[PDB]
Amino acid sequence: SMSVKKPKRDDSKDLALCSMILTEMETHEDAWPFLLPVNLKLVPGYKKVIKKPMDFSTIREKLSSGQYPNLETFALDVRLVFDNCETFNEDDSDIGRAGHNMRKYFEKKWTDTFKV
């Protein structure tokens, strides 16, 4: 509360660390469905259904331009990519399997990096 704070976590490396994680996401062989925005003119239903589209290039742009106030807002965008994927694609589809794989991949990195 006022004048009463938990010990200050060193947040000085977060930006570099999230960049690293994102670079690992981008180079994974199953990233291809998530590298660029879904093309809303060419994918019927997507615009109507998926209220907040998100993709790795957009996350990258937001990151490099200081648009994530903190760690968690970055994780929320990454998770949104996979929540969107789940909403639109069947689990038993190539893109549905990519999404599950990439989420698992992300959450382990997230844990190893920010929760020891």
Ligand SMILES: CC(=O)NCCCC[C@H](N)C(=O)O
């Ligand atoms: C990443 C994502 O959800 N893209 C939209 C779904 C694409 C559908 C794909 N072209 C298909 O044929 O199943």
